[PDB]
Amino acid sequence: TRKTYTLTDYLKNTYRLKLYSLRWISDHEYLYKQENNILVFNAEYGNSSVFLENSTFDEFGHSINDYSISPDGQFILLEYNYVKQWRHSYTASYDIYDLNKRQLITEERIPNNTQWVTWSPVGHKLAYVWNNDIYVKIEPNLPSYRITWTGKEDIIYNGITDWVYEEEVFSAYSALWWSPNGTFLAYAQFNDTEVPLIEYSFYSDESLQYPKTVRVPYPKAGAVNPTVKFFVVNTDSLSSVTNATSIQITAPASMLIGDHYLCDVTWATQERISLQWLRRIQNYSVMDICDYDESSGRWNCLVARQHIEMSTTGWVGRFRPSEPHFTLDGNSFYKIISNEEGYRHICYFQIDKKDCTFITKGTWEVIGIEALTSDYLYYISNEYKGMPGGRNLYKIQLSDYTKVTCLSCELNPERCQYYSVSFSKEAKYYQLRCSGPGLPLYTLHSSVNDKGLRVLEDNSALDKMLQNVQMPSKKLDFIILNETKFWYQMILPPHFDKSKKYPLLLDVYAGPCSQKADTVFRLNWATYLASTENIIVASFDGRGSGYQGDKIMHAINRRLGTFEVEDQIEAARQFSKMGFVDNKRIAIWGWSYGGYVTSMVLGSGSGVFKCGIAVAPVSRWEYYDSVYTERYMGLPTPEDNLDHYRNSTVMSRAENFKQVEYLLIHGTADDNVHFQQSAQISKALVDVGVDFQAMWYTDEDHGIASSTAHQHIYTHMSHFIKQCFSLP
Amino acid sequence: TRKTYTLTDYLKNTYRLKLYSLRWISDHEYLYKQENNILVFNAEYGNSSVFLENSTFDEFGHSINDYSISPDGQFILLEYNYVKQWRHSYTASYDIYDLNKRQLITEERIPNNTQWVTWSPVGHKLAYVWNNDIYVKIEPNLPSYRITWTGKEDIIYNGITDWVYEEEVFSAYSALWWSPNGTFLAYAQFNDTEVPLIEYSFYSDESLQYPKTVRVPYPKAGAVNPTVKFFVVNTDSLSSVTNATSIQITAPASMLIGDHYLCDVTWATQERISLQWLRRIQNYSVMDICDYDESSGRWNCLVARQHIEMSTTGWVGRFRPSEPHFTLDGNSFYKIISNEEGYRHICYFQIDKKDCTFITKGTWEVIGIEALTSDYLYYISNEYKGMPGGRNLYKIQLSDYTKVTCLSCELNPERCQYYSVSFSKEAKYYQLRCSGPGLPLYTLHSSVNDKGLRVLEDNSALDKMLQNVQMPSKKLDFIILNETKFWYQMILPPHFDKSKKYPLLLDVYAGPCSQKADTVFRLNWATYLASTENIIVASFDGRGSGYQGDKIMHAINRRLGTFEVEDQIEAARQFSKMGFVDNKRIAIWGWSYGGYVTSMVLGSGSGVFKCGIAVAPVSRWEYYDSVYTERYMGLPTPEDNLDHYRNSTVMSRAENFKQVEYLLIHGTADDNVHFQQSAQISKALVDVGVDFQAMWYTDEDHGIASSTAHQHIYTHMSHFIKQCFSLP
Ligand SMILES: *[C@@H]1O[C@H](CO)[C@@H](O[C@@H]2O[C@H](CO)[C@@H](O)[C@H](O)[C@H]2NC(C)=O)[C@H](O)[C@H]1NC(C)=O
Ligand SMILES: *[C@@H]1O[C@H](CO)[C@@H](O[C@@H]2O[C@H](CO)[C@@H](O)[C@H](O)[C@H]2NC(C)=O)[C@H](O)[C@H]1NC(C)=O
Ligand SMILES: *[C@@H]1O[C@H](CO)[C@@H](O[C@@H]2O[C@H](CO)[C@@H](O)[C@H](O)[C@H]2NC(C)=O)[C@H](O)[C@H]1NC(C)=O
Ligand SMILES: *[C@@H]1O[C@H](CO)[C@@H](O[C@@H]2O[C@H](CO)[C@@H](O)[C@H](O)[C@H]2NC(C)=O)[C@H](O)[C@H]1NC(C)=O
Ligand SMILES: *[C@@H]1O[C@H](CO)[C@@H](O[C@@H]2O[C@H](CO)[C@@H](O)[C@H](O)[C@H]2NC(C)=O)[C@H](O)[C@H]1NC(C)=O
Ligand SMILES: *[C@@H]1O[C@H](CO)[C@@H](O[C@@H]2O[C@H](CO)[C@@H](O)[C@H](O)[C@H]2NC(C)=O)[C@H](O)[C@H]1NC(C)=O
Ligand SMILES: *[C@@H]1O[C@H](CO)[C@@H](O[C@@H]2O[C@H](CO)[C@@H](O)[C@H](O)[C@H]2NC(C)=O)[C@H](O)[C@H]1NC(C)=O
Ligand SMILES: *C(=N)[C@@H]1CCCN1C(=O)CN[C@@]12C[C@@H]3C[C@@H](C[C@@](O)(C3)C1)C2
Ligand SMILES: N=C[C@@H]1CCCN1C(=O)CN[C@@]12C[C@@H]3C[C@@H](C[C@@](O)(C3)C1)C2
Ligand SMILES: *[C@@H]1O[C@H](CO)[C@@H](O)[C@H](O)[C@H]1NC(C)=O
Ligand SMILES: *[C@@H]1O[C@H](CO)[C@@H](O)[C@H](O)[C@H]1NC(C)=O
Ligand SMILES: *[C@@H]1O[C@H](CO)[C@@H](O)[C@H](O)[C@H]1NC(C)=O
Ligand SMILES: *[C@@H]1O[C@H](CO)[C@@H](O)[C@H](O)[C@H]1NC(C)=O
Ligand SMILES: *[C@@H]1O[C@H](CO)[C@@H](O)[C@H](O)[C@H]1NC(C)=O
Ligand code: NA
């Protein structure tokens, strides 16, 4: 009998997915790491040469974390002393290696404790942030020019985001944007002076006698938010003036009237930048398009070029307004926006005309715009077979919108229903990355004729390994509720027999615009539960879920902890009705938003679930950050939505936990969902005399992702589920 | 069949011990609160009068926490708005009621948030501490005189202790000492300027959006300690026009050479005060005896009147040097010190002679001196039947030390083997309080011929209730380790059958000078475990335990986490070989020092224990406070005892937890054993891949003592022990 996929398999990564991570350096060449050597590949022919031999930095004296080659290929930026901060942020040391001299640069080094570094998009200028101020080096071995003098720890951030902008607005630590040819450097400045601090203990190595208190400016719902300013500096003037002026571009009057955010920065041309601003009530956004005025040295944004994007049913964008993609001349752009039917499609704008033209339509959504040439726009959508959980690449002819070609749909339709893409610098080539439902498959293609050039990685090694394993299967389908299709997936045990009754674990996330039913191939905890423990692991996309239009997505507007919670309960009831589920053994688990929904479900008194596990749950919306929470909830004030903030807490449901077995887990150094949130759940449970199981993870953050903690948490959870389900 | 003593019985206090808490107000009368009325009793005859009717404060408008009648009976201090701080400290509001004119004083009230208040020992003066400064009121209706002006939150403490002095030196918040007739007020001042702060989160009610950070000056082992000064003020010469003059009494030269503590203050006469000082290396202490100089207004401590107390085998005193008991003229005193055989006995000192004379001797110890007259000294000891865990009252004739009379031994030998005592003002009467092995028994006696006047409370009500419950029994016995007897107790299930095998829980504390094997009657968690669950609950006093001489007590000097741990393992090994113990079901548990020892035992690799529970454990001595830790461990420096600090941690034993089931529990707001200690244990177990059970208690302190948390922890621990022992 073939072995199963065991817990140790998952935790030790015995069965490894191979990737093909390339970095395009031109329109026809990419870099790829093979046996620690960096190789340069010709895309057209597939031949390679050694770009940088793996012995080059043997005598460097530090383990190199990552590298970045300058666009002109003259220098390599070496990243070491990597110290992680939040989801995206980290600090590091940096050295620059001169590739032509084959020599490390030892003068005017990037300082230690540098927060962010980026090459210009052309050539080899560098911008970096150190002690919250911006510096620019025109040449790697020459002195830096200081751009800002206002940086102040935890207070003023120049060219980097604060906590909430990193996590919820930009999905990045960086807050600087080079113009296309590197002449201008645009940047944001955040001011957190009056933003309250989250404070928590960090215990460190056992050698530390007194715990440290970590203090991070973090606006919880309704609290004082950071303010923001936007500036542009001419880097070509730095060597000519003692102190080059950063020119401010102010937000429009419609934004200045109240609290607001900077939510997008996109350069259109060498002398034109677009900015999107979002009101703190996030159903109203404004794009300004601003041109450099050579005579005054200022940036001016004509009101005739200003574009309003608003929502009557919810917030603007999936998580924020979408980015524009400008035509080469910068006089028009394409942007994903919600159409009159509530489906997200590509609209084409002229910069000085307010009405746009939709170039795609239908009951499906465009996921992203991937590339734009003079003749074609390339985008990813879930159109194919009406499956919201699939992804394919399409090409639309700009001179004739009726001509739309699916580039990926039929390449391998059994194996490949979920694609992403990486285009070369001017879109001459593209790499397709298939991520399921079969094993991932990486292929290279030429744009001139859309022909497949070669297979880059087909995971044949893993395929061979998996043939000797009793792997689970995945079912993706839908149920019909109130004449609406809602999609679900099930990870099914090997040799699945529909005449038997299986225990079921509902794996929940269910946040707004989430999607937990898809065609992606995963090797995870669920794989083990199904393969070794014969547990069905199900997920369901109910009201609030994404990629299916605004009627579904905006259903939870101002009402988190309602329909998305109810729909998970209803999904479990419908799974029972299917006949192969032991109704005495239904469980639920989730992380973060999934931890909140798990806890809300367990506290609902539905009687459907025996047990559940919440990891790093939100418990009360007033504890979570302003940008995310208010997007869906508005403000926690009596004039706005306080009543619902107060009605949607886990704590208020404490008495109902007497009916279930609950395991509550949280990292003590979670900067995102504060340990506070679980500390309040446990206290409410103690106060009503509810017994439950708990586990804290010392010094772990939201990811509980250290090697040892990751192994420990899944091991602890596995015991809990197995006990609940009476599994030996 | 009759009922057992259940978990609910323990948690809801179904079976209540009655007390008889009296307050002596003279040599002949005491106060006793009965049905919220305060009565005055005549000791000779037992007749009473109502002193204060319960309905006197019906319209008060605040719930009264406690009361304190002035020594002259003219006034009553009413305590309300009680807010607990640490083990002893709290703040409260106070009102004074005039018992003669039957009215509340509304003039010059004691302020809210008062930290400490006390009547003078004679009359009706008041001293109180507010905002860390001392105030004196000569008459309750008159303005206070401000004594100190330097008080500053968390920095300068006048007349109250800081955290470490409260917990580990004085066992009290007060640092004020009135002279016997109230002329002088002596006080200490603590300076915590350079003492580091422990910081931890406090979550508060759900409504609090951001957790608070609590910061407490707390010296961990080897850190900067508070400094201390001592002063005396004459309260008879205070002025409304001039600031009060406090006279400093400085520490002896032998103390000033390095870090030191003030460890005892005891008035001898109206004009003579004794002080004991202790070096930070706590094996050297000095008593000064200081006389008021009426012509200069100074306090002079003659060097000829200094008394040195030191230890070559350990520290000085059980937890600190003992208090002196001065004769009427103050020219001599009696003090418990360790004799040349290492047994603590009463020594008689002349104030100006170096050599003292021991008045008691033998292989047993004096527990405390209780009263002193010109003819007799009254003391409690464990001499009787050579049982270190029993306690009886004795008197010794001061003119002939061979004449020692036991006053409690034979009163009721079967019921009463553990006594404490409360004497009237000049020792004319005494109340005996028997606390086991039978139900507590309170009796009143006259000293002149040791007549047993009357039974005050015999708990006959509880006896009647317990007749219908299957109660456990208690065996107190000894084992021999290496020619020395060491005592243990077992709480044995009802109908105990030595032909059956019972699971066994070892209930451990095992701190230095601890005693867990005694004759005290207790109704606690162990009562339930034995009565209802048929578990034997054993405790053992091994090396380091108290009341059996220094050979045993000082065995762990400079070596915590060694012999006291080994001896618990050895006791369990011996119990496991008894015919009535199931060697497959032996568990261990304890709180604080007991949590440390439990964890050290579970990490020993002994294989004797299946499971255990540690509650608020110490895990590493460098995390614990200076005064306690250094008493036993010296300083954590390479030149002193660092090596042993480093090899006595729980964390180093983590790998050995692989073969046990462990439950780790800690309150998040424990100001004493910081949550940090358990946070480091859990991290070490995670790092070696050991699974275990955990529970945090949000906002609970060292006691985990709120009604709801208390019920929850014992419920959780009960489930854990029952699961471990396979009990339904
Ligand atoms: C891949 O092969 C091509 C062509 O075979 C290489 O391009 C150059 O080809 C000329 C022939 O005219 C040779 O003289 C050179 O060796 C090549 N140029 C350079 C700059 O090396 C190409 O180099 C190969 N690409 C890689 C990445 O190895
Ligand atoms: C960041 O914002 C704060 C206000 O939150 C600014 O601080 C104020 O500055 C003015 C001086 O121009 C003072 O009069 C106020 O006392 C300050 N207010 C507070 C609350 O501190 C600060 O100048 C801003 N910093 C930057 C670089 O823009
Ligand atoms: C470069 O120019 C900036 C902008 O004028 C200077 O920043 C100002 O510095 C002064 C005092 O040092 C402050 O009063 C202003 O509030 C600052 N303004 C801003 C926008 O930061 C900066 O100091 C100059 N650097 C040098 C070397 O002169
Ligand atoms: C990058 O773009 C910038 C902005 O358009 C160019 O700078 C301008 O160059 C023209 C010459 O064609 C001058 O008339 C302007 O004075 C320049 N403007 C500014 C603001 O500097 C720049 O030359 C381009 N760089 C390269 C390398 O082509
Ligand atoms: C202790 O606190 C109370 C409440 O602050 C004080 O009571 C007074 O009455 C009301 C509320 O009960 C307050 O608004 C007044 O400010 C209080 N002041 C006075 C002068 O009556 C009470 O006075 C405080 N006691 C002392 C001794 O300061
Ligand atoms: C308490 O004791 C003090 C000190 O012995 C007494 O104060 C002395 O009293 C006599 C008068 O009989 C004076 O001659 C001394 O000068 C006083 N000394 C001081 C320091 O004040 C005091 O009388 C006693 N008080 C009571 C109420 O008995
Ligand atoms: C008090 O205890 C200390 C520590 O046990 C003793 O310290 C001695 O003196 C120095 C301290 O640096 C050490 O080098 C010696 O090794 C210690 N002597 C020993 C262990 O015998 C000190 O002697 C003690 N004091 C008394 C009065 O016994
Ligand atoms: C966990 N799910 C917590 C609590 C509720 C929201 N949340 C977040 O972390 C929100 N931040 C993001 C928002 C989206 C989706 C997730 C990844 C992210 O990068 C984009 C950040 C969570
Ligand atoms: N056992 C728990 C923790 C950790 C180790 C010492 N400790 C104390 O609380 C020490 N402080 C005292 C505890 C006991 C015995 C002494 C007097 C006491 O009041 C009660 C405080 C020391
Ligand atoms: C970075 O730190 C190291 C070690 O402290 C030091 O030797 C080096 O000079 C630093 N580099 C720079 C660029 O400051
Ligand atoms: C934005 O939301 C608020 C609260 O729901 C609402 O009052 C306002 O009308 C909305 N704006 C738009 C354009 O829908
Ligand atoms: C007790 O009795 C005596 C004499 O009978 C009496 O005078 C005295 O006041 C009484 N004491 C009390 C406290 O009632
Ligand atoms: C307290 O001690 C500090 C030194 O730690 C000293 O500077 C200060 O004066 C002291 N304060 C008082 C009131 O004694
Ligand atoms: C008493 O001392 C304080 C503090 O030094 C001072 O403010 C006050 O003026 C003094 N009062 C008199 C009467 O000297
Ligand atoms: Na009697």
XYZ file of C-alpha atoms and ligand atoms in Angstrom, chain B residues 109-112, ligand 5:
32
model
C -10.786 65.088 55.815
C -8.217 62.437 54.973
C -7.796 62.749 51.176
C -9.023 60.219 48.617
C -13.220 62.367 47.458
O -13.884 62.301 46.207
C -15.215 62.790 46.123
C -15.674 62.698 44.664
O -14.774 63.362 43.792
C -15.357 64.215 46.672
O -16.743 64.464 46.833
C -17.232 65.790 46.472
O -18.520 65.693 45.859
C -18.671 65.606 44.436
C -18.971 64.180 43.969
O -19.297 63.358 45.070
C -17.530 66.248 43.637
O -18.055 66.818 42.456
C -16.822 67.323 44.456
O -15.777 67.902 43.706
C -16.235 66.715 45.728
N -15.633 67.788 46.534
C -16.012 68.322 47.709
C -15.118 69.419 48.215
O -16.993 67.986 48.383
C -14.655 64.369 48.026
O -14.613 65.732 48.415
C -13.236 63.794 48.021
N -12.714 63.839 49.379
C -11.628 64.529 49.751
C -11.259 64.448 51.204
O -10.932 65.205 48.994
